[PDB]
Amino acid sequence: TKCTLKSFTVEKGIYQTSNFRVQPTESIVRFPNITNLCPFGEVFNATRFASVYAWNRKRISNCVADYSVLYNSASFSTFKCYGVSPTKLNDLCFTNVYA
Amino acid sequence: LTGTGVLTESNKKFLPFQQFGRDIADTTDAVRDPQTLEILDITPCSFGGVSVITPGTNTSNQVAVLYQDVNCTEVNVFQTRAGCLIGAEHVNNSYECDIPIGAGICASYQTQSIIAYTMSLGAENSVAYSNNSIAIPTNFTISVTTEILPVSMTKTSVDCTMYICG
Amino acid sequence: YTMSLGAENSVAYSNNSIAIPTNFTISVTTEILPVSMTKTSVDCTMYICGDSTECSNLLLQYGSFCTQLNRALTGIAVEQDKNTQEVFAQVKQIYKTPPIKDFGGFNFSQILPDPSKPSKRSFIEDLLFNKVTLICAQKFNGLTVLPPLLTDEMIAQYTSALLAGTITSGWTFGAGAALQIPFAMQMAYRFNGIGVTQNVLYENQKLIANQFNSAIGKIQDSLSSTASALGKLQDVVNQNAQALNTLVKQLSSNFGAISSVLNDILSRLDPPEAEVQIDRLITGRLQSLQTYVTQQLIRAAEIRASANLAATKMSECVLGQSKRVDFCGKGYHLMSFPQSAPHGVVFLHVTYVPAQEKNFTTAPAICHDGKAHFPREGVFVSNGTHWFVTQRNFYEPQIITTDNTFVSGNCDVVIGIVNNTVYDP
Amino acid sequence: SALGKLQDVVNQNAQALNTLVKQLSSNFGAISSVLNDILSRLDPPEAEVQIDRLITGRLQSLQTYVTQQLIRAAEIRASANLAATKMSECVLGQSKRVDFCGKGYHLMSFPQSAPHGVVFLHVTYVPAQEKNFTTAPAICHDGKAHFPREGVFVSNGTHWFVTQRNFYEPQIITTDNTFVSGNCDVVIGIVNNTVYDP
């Protein structure tokens, strides 16, 4: 009360100082149980790539995507994520990924 | 999708293509558990303001705490419509309101400790009404009372250019 | 259509004609006034930055834009409680009517508190409370509703004390100590207060009591039938509700950010851009909260004007008899009775209204012996042959004597003077 | 504390000003609350955005202060109108409005200046010592009903007098205290007595 009124002496009354809120007791993390790794290798290490005018699209689904292997590698000269942060990619689930 | 709150069994009927619900405030209201096909309703866990009923440091340093609009089971304890009061004794006697808590409950400092009571509106006084009885004064008093009214403020002026861009 | 201003009616004015009432009606009209708003309270941090340390740290860069909103809302709440205390708590003691209702034929059973009722509220109070009427969302985004200091039963007790004081003592209980007086005598004083001699009440006591009872019954039926009568109070409530509802829907706006959900931003982006998006959200939500608080301030100023008016009315209408025209119902004011209502008060204004009138031939003065005679209190009238002197508001003709009239001057100065006989007792 | 109201006003205004001043210490999302540091540290293209942030924040603070001042000045103007009405009807005259000029029947008022306010000394009349008397709405003398011209009939047990309502001063009932009307078959509660004729 003293620090919310900014006075070493506070006269009688009822003063609102702060807000009481319960704190979480346990941390719950939920995800679907899928084991197979996403076949990123067949995309980045593909022997042949399609011409830009006919850019290839691959559907990535029903797999675990360890994006760290991608953004911790030194093999890429440009890595730019728009609307997402690459570090956060390990804590997100996507609808249906396309490469 | 991260957040904090209480998860409870829901009675919502999610469609197969819907993952999570939403509230009018566009905040998530319910979710589908990714491993068990069950709908969990999300309710934010209890919160509310905290007020410090104090008799004033001039007379004492003892204070009572009012948690607003919460149940005492959730926080010398007293439950009132205003909330949960801790550090004040509940007294059946009634007095004039000194520090208003709410819902007809006021707190004071009396012999010492802080007490919470149901404020008294006034002294009960039945009028001796009768169809042939009048009450006429035989004497009077000339009373001088004081009425204070504000009439003006301080004529403040702000130099906006110097305030924003001194 | 071009709206009409009212029924056309000329007045048959002429320099020697007066229209005097020959009958009256006791009318109980109703006047509703809001007294207090809903004691809202907003959690600035939880509304803007619900359960997020990073958002709270970004928010505290704006300084005191949160604490002063809470200060303003607490001021509003204290103002509402003061409003209620001003309007209702104007009686030092708590009076009670006697067990026997020997009020000269007047029947207050429909406005006096019901002893068996669950809240000591009268029938009409129950009707009022039953004619005036999503909360989880509000109470999850930091918004909450504080309870008023005076519970509704305490307000009912206050109104019952005021009503009993008025009934059993007239206006005396407002000035000093309550002085009992038979109700018929009180009504005689009120009639004298409106320029009607007190014999009129005693000669029509049964009729006047019946008229008052019928008016109270009509008030009961009107309240039980038409809810919109209490619109004002309802309107207040509705306004507040809308405010809060809006204040919640503004949590769904992006305000330029990538998403209106804080958790999505905090989960998808790192601080260097998350804090930009959260700054956008904080600015938008803080602007919304400031707008809400300004609206609350304006509406509380309005409600404070209304509460001051209601307190003035309770002082000069219930606790006394007001001579101010149309301040206590159309017609001449006899008395008023308060009634509690959700966030407001309802006055029953008992007023005296002339009903049946007759044209008489009048005269400013009568010339008897060269001297001019004027009426001490009243007016000279003539039914065609004889000249009487009556009171202005009720045709009660009386022979003209030296006690009804006073002499001043002579007949050569007054314009319109007539000749007649002034009888000497 | 008697003059609390006036003091309160002052306090409120002060708080506003204080708040306003403290708003100068807020970054409002900029990199520093100090304008000169922003100017000296960043390049003009981005220092311009930072100073725009500061300008928006400080302008919003000023707007909030001005709006609050407008509302408080409307409050103070309502109060000043009430005080002017009280001075007109209370000091310059004698009001018959109940509780408008102090509890009790109003006699007069005296103004007194005060810092940003006025103080009325309301001199009023308050009945103190009250007695129970039997009463009647009229008295029946010769078949006619007599009502008091200005007052009420009272009885100390044996005799009937007519007294003014607000001060017990019994006087013998005479044809100069009372006026005649109708007959004794109408008034509910009429009593028998003698109307003395001077």
Ligand SMILES: *[C@@H]1O[C@H](CO)[C@@H](O[C@@H]2O[C@H](CO)[C@@H](O)[C@H](O)[C@H]2NC(C)=O)[C@H](O)[C@H]1NC(C)=O
């Ligand atoms: C009316 O009340 C006043 C006081 O309110 C009475 O005056 C007192 O009279 C006694 C003796 O007569 C004195 O001892 C007191 O000092 C007086 N008080 C004041 C304030 O002057 C007065 O006597 C009362 N009159 C009647 C008829 O009861």
Ligand SMILES: *[C@@H]1O[C@H](CO)[C@@H](O[C@@H]2O[C@H](CO)[C@@H](O)[C@H](O)[C@H]2NC(C)=O)[C@H](O)[C@H]1NC(C)=O
């Ligand atoms: C004055 O008006 C009242 C109506 O308010 C009259 O009372 C009615 O009188 C008629 C008979 O003429 C009865 O049938 C009604 O039942 C009465 N109504 C009520 C409410 O009592 C009264 O007679 C009128 N008096 C004069 C002298 O005109």
Ligand SMILES: *[C@@H]1O[C@H](CO)[C@@H](O[C@@H]2O[C@H](CO)[C@@H](O)[C@H](O)[C@H]2NC(C)=O)[C@H](O)[C@H]1NC(C)=O
């Ligand atoms: C005052 O009016 C009430 C009605 O508002 C009267 O109560 C009625 O009394 C009769 C019997 O006399 C019952 O048959 C009714 O059912 C009652 N009505 C209600 C609504 O309860 C009351 O009697 C009247 N007072 C007097 C003294 O007659």
Ligand SMILES: *[C@@H]1O[C@H](CO)[C@@H](O[C@@H]2O[C@H](CO)[C@@H](O)[C@H](O)[C@H]2NC(C)=O)[C@H](O)[C@H]1NC(C)=O
């Ligand atoms: C009222 O009476 C007076 C006197 O009784 C009348 O005055 C007379 O008027 C006539 C006509 O002008 C004169 O001849 C007389 O000399 C007047 N008498 C006196 C004593 O001055 C007056 O006209 C009468 N008015 C009415 C309306 O009847």
Ligand SMILES: *[C@@H]1O[C@H](CO)[C@@H](O[C@@H]2O[C@H](CO)[C@@H](O)[C@H](O)[C@H]2NC(C)=O)[C@H](O)[C@H]1NC(C)=O
């Ligand atoms: C009621 O008042 C009257 C007059 O004020 C009293 O009558 C007088 O009483 C006194 C005694 O104090 C006698 O000396 C007078 O002779 C009485 N006057 C007459 C005309 O008889 C009367 O006594 C009072 N009664 C009571 C019960 O107090």
Ligand SMILES: *[C@@H]1O[C@H](CO)[C@@H](O)[C@H](O)[C@H]1NC(C)=O
């Ligand atoms: C692609 O090849 C590199 C080196 O041969 C290997 O480190 C990587 O794991 C492979 N798969 C990818 C990049 O998905």
Ligand SMILES: *[C@@H]1O[C@H](CO)[C@@H](O)[C@H](O)[C@H]1NC(C)=O
């Ligand atoms: C995944 O979880 C569900 C329910 O928790 C279970 O029925 C299923 O067998 C699990 N799948 C695997 C591969 O463990």
Ligand SMILES: *[C@@H]1O[C@H](CO)[C@@H](O)[C@H](O)[C@H]1NC(C)=O
């Ligand atoms: C508060 O708790 C009491 C008993 O613990 C219970 O009866 C009451 O319903 C609770 N109120 C709320 C609002 O949860």
Ligand SMILES: *[C@@H]1O[C@H](CO)[C@@H](O)[C@H](O)[C@H]1NC(C)=O
């Ligand atoms: C107060 O009253 C309640 C019932 O009204 C009773 O249960 C309680 O014991 C009382 N407490 C004291 C201290 O008298």
Ligand SMILES: *[C@@H]1O[C@H](CO)[C@@H](O)[C@H](O)[C@H]1NC(C)=O
């Ligand atoms: C009085 O005279 C006017 C003359 O036009 C008439 O209209 C009116 O009805 C009369 N009043 C009554 C009560 O008859």
Ligand SMILES: *[C@@H]1O[C@H](CO)[C@@H](O)[C@H](O)[C@H]1NC(C)=O
């Ligand atoms: C007027 O009243 C008097 C007395 O009341 C009566 O003698 C006379 O006949 C009345 N005249 C008319 C026209 O009513």
Ligand SMILES: *[C@@H]1O[C@H](CO)[C@@H](O)[C@H](O)[C@H]1NC(C)=O
């Ligand atoms: C009223 O006016 C008429 C003229 O219209 C006049 O003849 C008459 O004397 C006047 N009467 C009075 C009492 O003024």
Ligand SMILES: *[C@@H]1O[C@H](CO)[C@@H](O)[C@H](O)[C@H]1NC(C)=O
């Ligand atoms: C009047 O009489 C009633 C009951 O008889 C009593 O309670 C009251 O105190 C009396 N008033 C005075 C002023 O003596």
Ligand SMILES: *[C@@H]1O[C@H](CO)[C@@H](O)[C@H](O)[C@H]1NC(C)=O
């Ligand atoms: C008062 O009531 C009693 C009984 O109820 C009755 O005898 C008496 O005549 C009444 N007096 C008046 C003035 O009404």
Ligand SMILES: *[C@@H]1O[C@H](CO)[C@@H](O)[C@H](O)[C@H]1NC(C)=O
């Ligand atoms: C009053 O006197 C009349 C006669 O003048 C008589 O008829 C009546 O009964 C008396 N009433 C009382 C209450 O004495």
